[PDB]
UniProtKB/Swiss-Prot annotation, chain A:
Role of this protein: Dipeptidyl carboxypeptidase that removes dipeptides from the C-terminus of a variety of circulating hormones, such as angiotensin I, bradykinin or enkephalins, thereby playing a key role in the regulation of blood pressure, electrolyte homeostasis or synaptic plasticity. Composed of two similar catalytic domains, each possessing a functional active site, with different selectivity for substrates.
Organism: Homo sapiens
Parent-record interval covered: 30 to 640 of 1306
The encoding gene: ACE
List of catalytic residues: 358, 487
Protein's UniProt name: Angiotensin-converting enzyme
Glycosylated residues in this chain: 9, 25, 45, 82, 117, 285, 412, 476
GO biological process: amyloid-beta metabolic process; angiotensin maturation; angiotensin-activated signaling pathway; antigen processing and presentation of peptide antigen via MHC class I; arachidonate secretion; blood vessel diameter maintenance; blood vessel remodeling; bradykinin catabolic process
Length: 607, 604
């Protein structure tokens, strides 16, 4: 560790802890920058050399965390919990948790190399027929636009096999090292550490109670969609009393169903709410999508994207043959100047929403860039994930799409409302079981309830239990289907997205009220509301300086996650789907839980 | 409720609570008897009228528990936790727990009535062909001795459909009413009350730690047995890397595997350690089996069965066209006089072990009959289930079988040691996953984690997770396969049996040491050891007066459940099974977790 980065001496008291944090800040920024920079160089340009540099930067960060971490524990171990400065205790608590820096050097290197290798495997995996398809864009477009049961099966099986199988031995080793590291910080396992970020003793119970309120909406959406799939694929491939085959919902993970809207839209005579075709016809490109997102932010009197963002960001998949991490992400370099998005942007309506989601991260970074580095995070991780989604809820309204030239015809009638709320349900309600189950799986792995011998057995138990889907080909424990989802090998927690999908409707309700809007919640558009902007800004500028329950109370008037705003938003389609399913004699659920579809005749040769 | 059973006036202090407890347990003695008496009349003669009277008795019991529980909180609710007397603290907290008495009257009627109907459905269900077969003895005998895949399937599917499907709507109603009752006592759900019996903050974690030490033994036994089934039935019906079809292990629930011993016995040249054929050749009957078990108890200077036991017990299935609950059980009438067994006894070796198990209960009853009622229980429920099994461990040794004329003396060689420990593994190790998982299922139902919409989904998840078996025909949520196991509709907790199967080896080691034995633990016979009997008598007389942790430490030197004795008992066959599986290149476990066998051609 360079001497400029090493901790000096401080009194064993709060006024030294305060200078401890200021000195830490000075050094942490440099260490965070070199770490983020090395990660950027690798993720935009996957090479063995760039992985080596990233691993050395990770080792430097561990060295730093150990020195300041053990200094913080040498002096302030019994006094940091009683400091009068609230932000200072949050700063100290972060610095003192060592994580992977608890591992001996040899195990730190093993851990860093596992992360790099898992990232390379996921983001360079390919499905081959000579020619070979990548996940983004090749397989993504197949899952989204093909309606050939056999072609979709080929992409689904090929992807899950290519990505999952080689990751499994690495993921087992990572899990053991991660647990070893956080056990030295006092946590029973890594999942307990991840859950502690929400500072709620009843977190898991709170989430289950939320999901109990939301599940009836999912069950009815599921039964309605299953019926539409049955009319296209037939009784051989769709069981009206069984799980839906996991490759038929428009998405590799069946996590968002927006791409099958054309098959489920109840009133096709109304305006076409999937504006992808109009974007193509009009010649939209990636940079236009980002400029339109930015202008919504500035319409609220939030910050534009700085020059450093436009000069440094990767907004399209490189055409020079480089391998890149294509999963969309937003980057804070912790120098208060450099902020970037990395996205292999495609010209579609759902990608326009993803652009807003990522730019919402950037807006957060810009608003809290002047806080201490330890407080440059969301009030909780679900806050960070919800910011851009909240704006995108306004952007997706038919009225707003008309304003930006993507929907010529504009209607206000009950059929058009049902169409729109059904499309939004395919995006927001269909995701809820998946956003809930992923970390239930990983929590069980981290705790040891799910050993390697049950990785896939327990994954598919949860997939069927919550999503009501089944794998379209047989799987066994050689397969590692959880590994075929970006966040698992890239070790990004997932429960934040279930929290986000609830929270964003709480935010939307509050911002719409602040904007003076007095119509139906799902027709609200906060575009150009500077009052809504100022309320959102107060949240963003707080970072993690205050408990999220208090930040939420100031914003929405409640100190807890609450499903009622989401339920209110969807109320009309919730009632309509329930009526439709009853009239059609649907079975809610999948009581034939053991059913799987047969294989296509002449599979996989027809491909 | 009779005035003489309603509670009197008592001071609000520990001295008054001492008189309170005495007056409670003198009046409880009379109420319990009339409940047990009416249950007995029903289970040995299932009719609507005996159901009516058993329910009248249950309502009266709930009236009694109400009156005395409400008085107990009225007087002592804020002070009893501070009594110096630990036994009195035990009694009062119990009396303060009302259970189904917390229900309003109309719900009490409904709850009492669901129990009667679930019991009738399970014990009268039949499988009819294309004559009708009953579970005991007909289907039991088919599962134990048929080696026809299709016949075993017909019996397995027939039974699970006939019992499970009609029970499901009733079990849902029962679950809801049971949870409503015990929430009023402060339990999050009925499962939490059941678990509270073990007075351990870390019960579930401790069980999981026990199972982690036992699972390698089960996995090796499983893979060895799967290989033997593959040879018999073929690659069509057995997947060497997948779960075993659930009907092929000699038992309707695949819960113990001793009945396929003759298919997996490695050294069939050696003496047949299944002495069933000798029992029949010699003319054994139910009454002989009970007299032989009795004499083991008295050989230890424990009590004989009293005249009331022999006159009142039902030791054979009645042949007078009558319907009975055939599941074996042992009855305490809480009058210090009447103790009985109800068993549809068959002349087989595993039934001789079941006879000892049931007589274990009776011996317990006899040794604590003078205690005040609230203590007339095992230190915990697993203690009660373990007593007879411990003696049966001695009875099953080839040396003891030789003493009682059921085995021509065998040689103390290695092939006979392996043969024996394998047969015992089929009976004891194979049970461990099942004993563990049944109440995992039931706890999730009570907690709400498992709604009716996932009863069968979650049952088969657990059956595959723990036992590594699969249903031999497709199942869906119309089926209620948990309902096809006696203890579910008859609402008898199951974790006691996992506890018992670990505890009995701790008891066995303690008693063998106390007897002076010094050979291998699995060759010990405590027959006629009056010192062993004396140390066991102490446990039985303690009832539930002292915490089971203290009773246990007095007997075995340790205050907690421990798998080491079980591991020591089986050590030699654990090593041998490991070697056999490596030689055959077995995969341990069932990584093809999705696999199910195909149907037989033109079945049924
Ligand atoms: C689409 O249309 C709906 C429905 O409009 C209402 O019903 C129609 C059948 C006609 O009768 C319309 O004249 C009628 O407004 C619109 O929702 C409605 O918006 C208005 C605001 O413009 C709401 O009125 C307000 O209501 C509150 C009480 O909550 C008062 O405090 C306000 O002063 C004001 O009167 C009205 O409640 C609301 N109706 C419903 C059912 O939500 C909607 O605005 C419109 N959308 C677009 C994009 O044009
Ligand atoms: O979350 C991230 N993008 C979005 C995203 O992935 N999702 C969320 C979504 C997707 C699209 C539109 C939305 O309105 C929201 C929900 C689903 C979930 C999903 O797609 O699975 C990056 S910012 C997080 C990261 C990535 C790499 C890292 O190394 C570190 C962090
Ligand atoms: O346990 C009881 N018999 C034995 C028994 O069932 N088993 C235990 C066993 C079976 C055979 C031999 C043994 O060494 C032990 C373990 C499995 C388990 C099983 O067979 O599933 C009555 S005492 C239980 C009851 C009956 C009716 C009631 O109303 C209340 C309780
Ligand atoms: C991707 O990373 C590689 C390194 O892995 C870069 O290759 C270097 O390119 C520079 C040019 O600036 C050369 O001087 C070095 O010799 C190269 N190093 C190696 C090891 O080949 C490459 O430039 C990067 N690509 C992009 C577009 O940034
Ligand atoms: C069967 O033989 C074994 C040894 O082959 C006997 O075990 C020995 O028992 C004596 C005491 O009787 C001990 O001193 C030895 O240490 C034991 N040896 C082993 C290897 O355990 C066993 O007692 C014999 N049992 C019978 C019933 O004959
Ligand atoms: C449940 O199962 C019943 C019994 O048949 C089983 O399911 C059918 C579909 C076949 O696969 C058969 O081999 C199985 O044994 C069916 O009658 C019933 O329709 C099934 N579905 C429901 C909702 O109960
Ligand atoms: C798992 O499935 C694959 C392909 O279906 C197969 O090659 C493999 O043998 C199966 N079993 C195991 C144990 O891997
Ligand atoms: C069985 O019960 C019925 C009605 O309860 C009664 O009439 C009959 O005598 C009983 N049979 C025996 C054998 O006790
Ligand atoms: O050697 C193990 C044991 O075997 C038997 C006797 O020989 C004992 O004295 C000894 O404890
Ligand atoms: C049955 C006997 O048990 C003991 C061993 O010392 C002998 O070699 C033999 O295995
Ligand atoms: Cl998170
Ligand atoms: Cl129990
Ligand atoms: Mg799309
Ligand atoms: Mg048996
Ligand atoms: Zn994000
Ligand atoms: Zn018993």
């Amino acid at each position: 560790l360079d001497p400029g980065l090493q901790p000096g001496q401080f009194s064993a008291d709060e006024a030294g802890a305060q200078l401890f944090a200021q000195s830490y800040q000075s050094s942490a920024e440099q260490v965070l920058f070199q770490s983020v920079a090395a990660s950027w160089a690798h993720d935009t340009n996957i090479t063995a050399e760039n992985a080596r540099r990233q691993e050395e930067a990770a080792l430097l960060s561990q060295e730093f965390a150990e020195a300041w971490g053990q200094k913080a524990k040498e002096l302030y171990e019994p006094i940091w919990q009683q400091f009068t400065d609230p932000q200072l205790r949050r700063i100290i608590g972060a610095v003192r948790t060592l994580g992977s820096a608890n591992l001996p050097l040899a195990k730190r290197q093993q851990y860093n190399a596992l992360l790099s290798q898992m990232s390379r495997i996921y983001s360079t995996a390919k499905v081959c027929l000579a020619t070979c398809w990548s996940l983004d864009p090749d397989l993504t477009n197949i899952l989204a636009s093909s309606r050939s049961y056999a072609m979709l099966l080929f992409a689904w099986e090929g992807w899950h096999n290519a990505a999952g199988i080689p990751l499994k031995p690495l993921y087992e080793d990572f899990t053991a090292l991660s647990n070893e590291a956080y056990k030295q910080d006092g946590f029973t396992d890594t999942g307990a550490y991840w859950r502690s970020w929400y500072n709620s003793p009843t977190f898991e119970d709170d989430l289950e109670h939320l999901y109990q309120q939301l599940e009836p909406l999912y069950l009815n959406l599921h039964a309605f969609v299953r019926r539409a799939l049955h009319r296209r694929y037939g009784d051989r491939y769709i069981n009206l009393r069984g799980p839906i085959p996991a490759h038929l919902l428009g998405d590799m993970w069946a996590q968002s169903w927006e791409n099958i809207y054309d098959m489920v839209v109840p009133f096709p005579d109304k305006p076409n709410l999937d504006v992808t075709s109009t974007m193509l016809q009009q010649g939209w490109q990636a940079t236009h999508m980002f400029r339109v997102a930015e202008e919504f932010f500035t319409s609220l009197e939030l910050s534009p994207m700085p020059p450093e963002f436009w000069e440094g960001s990767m907004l399209e998949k490189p055409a020079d043959g480089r391998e890149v991490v294509c999963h969309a992400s937003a980057w804070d370099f912790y120098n208060r100047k450099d902020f970037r998005i990395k996205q292999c942007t495609r010209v579609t309506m759902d990608q326009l929403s993803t652009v807003h989601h990522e730019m919402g991260h950037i807006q957060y970074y810009l608003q809290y860039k002047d806080l201490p580095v330890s407080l440059r995070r969301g009030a909780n991780p679900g806050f960070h994930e919800a910011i851009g989604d909240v704006l995108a809820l306004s952007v997706s309204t038919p009225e707003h799409l008309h304003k930006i030239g993507l929907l010529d015809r504009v209607t206000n009638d009950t059929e058009s409302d049902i169409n729109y709320l059904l499309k939004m349900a395919l995006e927001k309600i269909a995701f809820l079981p998946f956003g809930y189950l992923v970390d239930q799986w990983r929590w069980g792995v981290f705790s040891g309830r799910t050993p390697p011998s049950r990785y896939n057995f327990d994954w598919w138990y949860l997939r069927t239990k919550y999503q009501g889907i089944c794998p379209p080909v047989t799987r066994n424990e050689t397969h590692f289907d959880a590994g075929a989802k970006f966040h698992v090998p890239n070790v990004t927690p997932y429960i934040r997205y279930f929290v986000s999908f609830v929270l964003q409707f709480q935010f939307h309700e509050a911002l719409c009220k602040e904007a003076g809007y007095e119509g139906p919640l799902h027709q609200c558009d906060i575009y150009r509301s500077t009052k809504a902007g100022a309320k959102l800004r107060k949240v963003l500028r707080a970072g993690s300086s205050r408990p999220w329950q208090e930040v939420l109370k100031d914003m929405v008037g409640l100190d807890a996650l609450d499903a009622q705003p989401l339920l209110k938003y969807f109320q009309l389609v919730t009632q309509w789907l329930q009526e439709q399913n009853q009239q059609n004699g649907e079975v809610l659920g999948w009581p034939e839980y053991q059913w799987h579809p047969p294989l296509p005749d002449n599979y996989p040769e027809g491909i």
